[PDB]
Enzyme design. Sequence first.
Site, PDB file in Angstrom:
ATOM      1  N   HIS A   1      45.383  24.752  86.990  1.00 40.32           N
ATOM      2  CA  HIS A   1      44.432  24.900  85.894  1.00 40.32           C
ATOM      3  C   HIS A   1      43.121  24.240  86.281  1.00 40.32           C
ATOM      4  CE1 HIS A   1      47.500  26.370  83.139  1.00 40.32           C
ATOM      5  NE2 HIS A   1      48.276  25.373  83.532  1.00 40.32           N
TER       6      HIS A   1
ATOM      7  N   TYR B   1       7.466  25.639  69.147  1.00 42.48           N
ATOM      8  CA  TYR B   1       7.757  26.924  68.519  1.00 42.48           C
ATOM      9  C   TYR B   1       6.644  27.937  68.718  1.00 42.48           C
ATOM     10  CZ  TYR B   1       9.292  30.235  64.886  1.00 42.48           C
ATOM     11  OH  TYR B   1       9.719  31.352  64.197  1.00 42.48           O
TER      12      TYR B   1
ATOM     13  N   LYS C   1       6.693  31.415  70.812  1.00 38.10           N
ATOM     14  CA  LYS C   1       6.434  32.686  70.153  1.00 38.10           C
ATOM     15  C   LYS C   1       5.422  33.498  70.953  1.00 38.10           C
ATOM     16  CE  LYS C   1       5.024  34.749  65.667  1.00 38.10           C
ATOM     17  NZ  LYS C   1       4.719  34.556  64.196  1.00 38.10           N
TER      18      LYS C   1
END
Lengths: 194, 193
Positions: free
Chosen positions: B16, B137, B141
């Site tokens: 694993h 932001y 944008k």
Amino acid sequence: MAMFYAHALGGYDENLHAFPGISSTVANDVRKYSVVSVYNNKYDIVKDKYMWCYSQVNKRYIGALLPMFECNEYLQIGDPIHDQEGNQISIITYRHKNYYALSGIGYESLDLCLEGVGIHHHVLETGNAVYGKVQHDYSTIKEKAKEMNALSPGPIIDYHVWIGDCICQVTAVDVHGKEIMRMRFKKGAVLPIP
Amino acid sequence: AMFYAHALGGYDENLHAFPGISSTVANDVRKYSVVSVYNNKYDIVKDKYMWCYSQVNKRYIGALLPMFECNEYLQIGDPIHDQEGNQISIITYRHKNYYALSGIGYESLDLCLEGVGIHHHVLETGNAVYGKVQHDYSTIKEKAKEMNALSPGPIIDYHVWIGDCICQVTAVDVHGKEIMRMRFKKGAVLPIP
């Protein structure tokens, strides 16, 4: 006042916030609600089970795990959803039997440019394993993975969304079906019924 | 139960695999609230995680793992036990006094790395992401508007963005245009090497 437009009614607007099935002038965090109201009825949000919802607009895929609430009545796309103070927070988008999605900023999400690739959605059976573009029981998949381990990876051509009762996964495959990528979302969910 | 550190050359393709660990067992480490290292008990941090990853043989294994706070220095490979004294993991990654608990954890990303790169970033609080960049932001944008015109090409790089309330992974083409994004709604830190 906040405005909400349903993609299924042609309301997609690239200059608005986009969530599964919704373009909106606001971006509401819908994870925080435990109850909603539609018309004269209040409904409880389901704890610990979600709905994988998606829309495809302008070669853009927008998918996410959303909260859902239980409602035995039939609700129609675009019906306003309110919070407890009567403020509109969403609109009806998707349904799975008596469950309705609450679309907005939700839980784990997938966004894709659909140029040159496809995307496919599957209900993952409890106890099944996944390799690439298939699910089957653990023993069959283990043998499938050994067979494909030898292949050299090529570019991704398809995504596969696997929505299970205790886990959600997305795989990506090349043209030979070799698994190139896998993401796991540790939540159980259902898919909408169209 | 055997646990081997990838950083100490312990990867074994037939065992694993989790971030930094190959093991004869697959322990769900989401369930522990206390662990013990040597003779000392430590509390698992609530609602904040560590994005840990290892890259072995053109394969990337990354996941959000639980972490515990411990002021003492712990070394890679030291056994981590549950409260009943069973070994459940080994020390792998650290961020100051937080230590990852590696095993089956939360949201994860597995990748074939042939032909693509992967890069990890601390997402600053309040910043947004486009493609291979973060910024405030309004700048993002404008970045998205600029990039929206380019035609999408094949994925060449993945960018992992680890923030205090959200984690995101983007995939970009050669221009940095965003081809794909996944969001994990958990806050986390990255290990400090």
